[PDB]
Amino acid sequence: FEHATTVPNVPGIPYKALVERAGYAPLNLEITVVSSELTPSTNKEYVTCRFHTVIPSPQVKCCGSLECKASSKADYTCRVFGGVYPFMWGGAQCFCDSENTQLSEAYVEFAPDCTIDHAVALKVHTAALKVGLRIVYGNTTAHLDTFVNGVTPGSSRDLKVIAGPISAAFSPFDHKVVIRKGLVYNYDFPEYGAMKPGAFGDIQASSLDATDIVARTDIRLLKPSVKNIHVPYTQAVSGYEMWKNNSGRPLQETAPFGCKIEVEPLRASNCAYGHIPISIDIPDAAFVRSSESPTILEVSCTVADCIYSADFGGSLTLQYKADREGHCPVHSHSTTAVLKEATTHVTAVGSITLHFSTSSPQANFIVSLCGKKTTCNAECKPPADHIIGEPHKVDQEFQA
């Protein structure tokens, strides 16, 4: 038989529902969201880190003539100056002391510590959700992982389940994602080839070992004046360390709806938002007819003290007249009340106690025990406690 429910998508809390077949005894089901991983699709466009401005050795012709040569290095800067007359230890490395034409060379390349400390930039698309579900029916339990699309099914040896789509789609990521050492930043990056001096992504390369390193961080050379040979070179400061200094806080600390963002692969784990529509094809062998499970004759609701707290702060007592000993399940069929227990042992003549939780200040919920229903009327006092370390399992309705 196929049963479709609207489970709230909050991990860690159970959701209880009771199936009602026309000619069969009711059976209890309990669905728990043990895990839910929201994994977007990412592609690497470049990587960045702190660059090392490697300086090639200058070389001089005595009084010849030089020319600038075009190269493919990252931010290749080439500048030709006039007479320098260099000094190393003997004070004469060049004859013909007029027009000692000198060549200056400078380009940037990755630091050797960029194999760990590097920032990768990512762009993400519409993200799909995959949820892990633990289901029990009667006495038999099952664990299953499925995708949230409304199309992909899940199977654990007897079961067919269809989950999705999400009623309110949510993505904590922006369009631009930066990963550094496991920390996720929703910081906008300049595009490929459009570098900014002194800002993020001033050096770009497809991988750490790629030879197609492209950058432009504004190296300008200066004419040297000292007799000792040395090339002067002045720069904009690296934008990687400036972006490190002006980082802000990561999305492990600022993502909404309270979920830990995990990396490798980039994903969001245990993130409660919206409701999940799930349709469960329960196998027919789990069901049992109403002639085998004992039914009660009459049942009345005697309600104890109740508190509309986030914990099971309500007590209730049901007296029952039955025909045989059995294992009737319990279910409160209102949207404002849940039960601690899902099943109990039922005698012939006797009474049992049960616990419940609610959120409305009044109690107008309906209680079932093997099919038939009996209303309960009570008034719940405001809770003495202010903050409890257990989430609200239920939501308050409109003007209820």
């Binding site: 600390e253 309270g258 830990k260 509309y308 707290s309 986030a310 959120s359 405001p382 809770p383 003495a384 406690d385 202010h386 903050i387 409890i388 370390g389 257990e390 989430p391 609200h392 308050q396």
Partner: peptide, 28 residues
């Protein structure tokens, strides 16, 4: 520090500890 919490909850991380989630009740 006075921190206002909502009904949906609030998670605070104090140092390098495990994050602890709290939720507000309706104790009006």
């Amino acid at each position: 520090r006075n921190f206002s919490v909502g009904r949906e909850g609030l998670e605070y991380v104090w140092g390098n500890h495990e994050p602890v989630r709290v939720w507000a009740q309706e104790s009006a």
